[PDB]
Amino acid sequence: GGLKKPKKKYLAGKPKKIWNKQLLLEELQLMGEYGLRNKKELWLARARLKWIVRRARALLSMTAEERAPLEVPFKEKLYKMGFIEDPNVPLDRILSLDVRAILERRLQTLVFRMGLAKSIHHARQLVVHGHVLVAGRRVTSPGFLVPRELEDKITIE
Amino acid sequence: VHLRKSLAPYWWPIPRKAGGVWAVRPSTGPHSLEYSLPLAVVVRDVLRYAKTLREARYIISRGYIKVDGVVRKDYKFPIGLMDVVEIVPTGEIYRVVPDEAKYYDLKPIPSSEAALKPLRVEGKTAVSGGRIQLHFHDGRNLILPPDVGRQIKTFDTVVYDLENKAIKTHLPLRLGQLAVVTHGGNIGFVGQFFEVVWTLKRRQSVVALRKGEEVRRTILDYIMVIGTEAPVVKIS
Amino acid sequence: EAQFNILSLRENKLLGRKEVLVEILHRKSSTPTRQSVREWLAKQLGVEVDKIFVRKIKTEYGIGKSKAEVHVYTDGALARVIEPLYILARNLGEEGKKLLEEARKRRNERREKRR
RNA sequence: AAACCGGUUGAUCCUGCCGGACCCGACCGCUAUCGGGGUAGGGCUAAGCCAUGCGAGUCGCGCGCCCGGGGGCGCCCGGGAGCGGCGCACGGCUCAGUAACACGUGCCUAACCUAACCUCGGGAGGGGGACACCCCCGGGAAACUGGGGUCAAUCCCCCAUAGGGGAAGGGCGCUGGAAGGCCCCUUCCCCGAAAGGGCUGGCGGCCGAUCCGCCGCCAGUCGCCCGAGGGUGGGGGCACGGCCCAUCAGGUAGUUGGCGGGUUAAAGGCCCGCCAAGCCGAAGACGGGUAGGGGCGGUGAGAGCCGCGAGCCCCGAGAUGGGCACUGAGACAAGGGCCCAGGCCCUACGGGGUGCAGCAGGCGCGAAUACUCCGCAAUGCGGGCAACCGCGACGGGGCUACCCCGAGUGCCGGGCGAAGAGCCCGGCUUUUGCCCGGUCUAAAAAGCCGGGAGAAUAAGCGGGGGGCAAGUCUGGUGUCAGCCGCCGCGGUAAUACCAGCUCCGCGAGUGGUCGGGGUGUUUACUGGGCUUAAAGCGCCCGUAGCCGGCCCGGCAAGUCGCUCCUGAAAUCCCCGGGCUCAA
Ligand SMILES: [Mg+2]
Ligand SMILES: [Mg+2]
Ligand SMILES: [Mg+2]
Ligand SMILES: [Mg+2]
Ligand SMILES: [Mg+2]
Ligand SMILES: [Mg+2]
Ligand SMILES: [Mg+2]
Ligand SMILES: [Mg+2]
Ligand SMILES: [Mg+2]
Ligand SMILES: [Mg+2]
Ligand SMILES: [Mg+2]
Ligand SMILES: [Mg+2]
Ligand SMILES: [Mg+2]
Ligand SMILES: [Mg+2]
Ligand SMILES: [Mg+2]
Ligand SMILES: [Mg+2]
Ligand SMILES: [Mg+2]
């Protein structure tokens, strides 16, 4: 008798104890470097990071036969998004993946890391006002997680 | 009578969520609701000739579509296994055949085998005059004299002439023929009949098919004999 | 400005039309007028403008690019019985407006009678 | 992230509760710019009462009549009131009854019916009638309704034959696992079809402009009757599965079964005549309480717990309470009927209507709630040869802090300011807000594309003694007022109250009270404890239950492995793709 409704997708990266000093210090650093809007964006990055790690955890627990069809395609898909660097690492190497690798794929970060803007908050403003063309199309969402192949197509107006 | 989109058969080539809350309901024709597709769905989805339901009804209303030699002007007419669908103004012919992916597919066929339909004998009844009536997998019937109808047992496949209302060729169900699975998980598979575990109910007998050397098993109910090493009519 | 090219063309003998697909490429420019698309297609296919109907012009996000779905009919009489009234009212100029308008007067009729 | 932290002591180790931190659901407070996706909204409250409107029609290719325009061959077209066919038993709403063959899964009907539709075989001959619209009159407040005349049918009826039912005897034969079945034969009794109708074209004949038809035939097409099967819908049956209470222990008497009958479409104590004493129960009857069942949903790392098991889908039941029937394939019928009960409404007092658990809407209750809006374009359905018509189903938007997703409320440099806020200066951009055009849309709206001015139009909520991030800064009060989930403060120097300044958390949100889960190994299967903290019956005999020595042989029930038919869709996990990414 229950009707399904959507739930928050950033809950997996949300800490259940927000009032930790060292926790507040580390997260405040991350928002500063990458110019995020609120902690929801930061938690949304971690929720992606938990997916990549929890999926890799389960694939380790799967049998060798079961792991085989999914092992290489999983690493290859991670490589193409730009999270990882080698798509041929051991599967346990993905377990130590760090949340900054997901934050670098944000479209706002790439505009700043490509020297296309003065500051990271300026690069967010560039995407917001619609001066950043991704393969010729205006992509105005600064939190866009650009994959590897699309990265070289980023231009300004 | 309505048909909610949720209650539509799973294998139908329509989106499950996106669309209206309704689906076109077949009008009790020569098939089963679970194993038939209405004519308006075929004209709109499988052939893509109509973009709306009114356009599909318009195409059907002109008699452009022929199903087994009879022009069907009903947009809720059911189509099913081994049916011959012919589009008059374009001249294309299809035979709805068991498919490994779509579960039921419109395959083009040559014009020669368009009047032929392979029918599986579902049973026989004794009618007045002492004659025998044959019931086929799509509910079609054929009355025969008693001696000729004695030698056609159930599950035998007969190639039926829609043009002459006759039996071209009778294919008995014996071990060693070519069979196609017409229902169940193993649909679309064509292979040799080489193994049977005869149960107390013959319709529930376990049968095995081989294609060198992928072996699939089903029940005896779910396989149609299509002949010896050469299939009699194009199905794949 | 306005780059037009026939992206695809499907020949439909049942409805007596060729459902054509057009690719409109208008960088830094407004969405093309539906009349302008019909003029190009009629000049392109060599047919009269009355036989060509623009169904929908859909414009992509973030760039001046559009895709239009068009029906070109062999004979005008059958076209006015197959295409919906609002498509004719969008495309035929004034006559479809009357056809829509004359439809409405027959709709108030049979509704006061149902009263 | 498989997590702990506060508090019983002078101090300590425990036990054990209560609190904090998190997610979701309802209601509420303060605040509130934009967009996208979504099956969010009087459910958790009275199945309480209702003004008003809209909510099932369609067919002239079944039928006659009337009217208007046109034309001569035999009519064309438009319209009207009707008869007639089919549909209105689908669709929409709600959750009282129900602890039950209601629901779920897996099987049956060899004990059954089914209009529309599909296939095979066969048939369509003879003869009659009535009633509407209409015309001449009405009656009545209205509802409704009377008499005479008169034209038809795919309207109704008769006759024939086919066919059908029963009883009885026989059989090679069929189906099927198995014949009280089908088929064939014989005897009798009994019931008992049809619309060759419409259209199109061709032929011929009768007839006449006061007719615009009628007749015979042929073909095409849409139809009608019978037999068989299928299909669909439905009636019925079975095995098993899913709440609490013993401060509820005996219950049942058509009750349990048998035989013979009636009724039914069909089996049955369904009902009836006779015969017996059986049937259920501590493996929990009976009684009470609660509840529509499922798909499923929330929460947790999981086992599990809970139902927010409201919204979407499937089944069920209901239409103010309780009953009973007509028609029909199907109802004992939400916008049909009749009766009782209980209301209300109009009335000319003689009558006649009505019950919104339909879509809007009003009153009422309550902590708590939307427009008396637009369209049949999409998805479907009924009707039609078709065209097309209709549809508060459905689609569209409005309102609403409904759920999820993406953003803004500026960016760069400089000075003052504190490295903050803020102020000012110089340069930049226009997401967004505003105006306009194209596109979109049934039409609007929003979206999208493009153009103009412009920093210009846009931040709150809760907190700073510990838990727990944030002030031993200042003013005021002085165990008063106030705070406080717990611990605990305040009685003159208050980091806890009221204020200023300042800082902290989250941010178009943030809080308060509730409910569920975690918390919690405080329900313990995983996985607790019982000497003394709560907890071994004062002791023993034993029924059900649970648990039980060794070896050999058999079966294969459990169990294990493979495969098949299944376990609706949606929901869930993984992978690919398409909306700008996202949802
Ligand atoms: Mg735990
Ligand atoms: Mg103490
Ligand atoms: Mg507690
Ligand atoms: Mg209510
Ligand atoms: Mg007709
Ligand atoms: Mg009329
Ligand atoms: Mg009628
Ligand atoms: Mg219903
Ligand atoms: Mg009379
Ligand atoms: Mg009749
Ligand atoms: Mg019989
Ligand atoms: Mg008779
Ligand atoms: Mg007659
Ligand atoms: Mg009986
Ligand atoms: Mg009884
Ligand atoms: Mg609702
Ligand atoms: Mg009642």
Ligand SMILES: [Mg+2]
């Ligand atoms: Mg009633």
Ligand SMILES: [Mg+2]
């Ligand atoms: Mg009521």
Ligand SMILES: [Mg+2]
């Ligand atoms: Mg419609």
Ligand SMILES: [Mg+2]
């Ligand atoms: Mg948001």
Ligand SMILES: [Mg+2]
């Ligand atoms: Mg300074």
Ligand SMILES: [Mg+2]
């Ligand atoms: Mg607009």
Ligand SMILES: [Mg+2]
């Ligand atoms: Mg404040």
Ligand SMILES: [Mg+2]
């Ligand atoms: Mg203070």
Ligand SMILES: [Mg+2]
């Ligand atoms: Mg602290």
Ligand SMILES: [Mg+2]
């Ligand atoms: Mg405090």
Ligand SMILES: [Mg+2]
């Ligand atoms: Mg304990």
Ligand SMILES: [Mg+2]
């Ligand atoms: Mg003792």
Ligand SMILES: [Mg+2]
């Ligand atoms: Mg005691």
Ligand SMILES: [Mg+2]
């Ligand atoms: Mg004992």
Ligand SMILES: [Mg+2]
């Ligand atoms: Mg076993």
